[PDB]
Amino acid sequence: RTTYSKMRSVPDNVPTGKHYLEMGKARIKLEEL
RNA sequence: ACGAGAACGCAGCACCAGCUGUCCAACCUGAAGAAGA
């Protein structure tokens, strides 16, 4: 029942350097066998 | 005072011998813990 323009993010803090990173990142790479 | 009387259709003998209730077959198909706590 709450109206919002967009789905706000949920960043974090890493130890200090206040770096905001979205929880759950990864990379994709493909190699034979 | 009978075409009569007397006379066990009876004795011995395994419904038995051989024979896989077996053969093939996936408990399998399709489906985020997100979301304003």
Q: What is the 3-state secondary structure (H, E, C) of chain A?
A: CCCCCCCCCCCCCCCCCCCCCCCCCCCCCCCCC
Contact predicate A23/A14, CB 8 Å? no
Tokens of A7: 């789905």
Using C1' positions and the CA of A1, the closest nucleotide is B36
CA atoms within 13 A on the CB side of A25: 5
Contact predicate A16/A29, CB 8 Å? no
Q: Strand B: which positions are within 7 A of a protein CB?
A: 35-37
Give the technique used to solve this structure: cryo-EM
Cα–Cα dist A22/A20, whole Å = 7
Token pair 């790479």 is at which residue?
Answer: A29
Q: Which residues touch strand B (CB under 7 A)?
A: A 2, 4, 7-8, 10
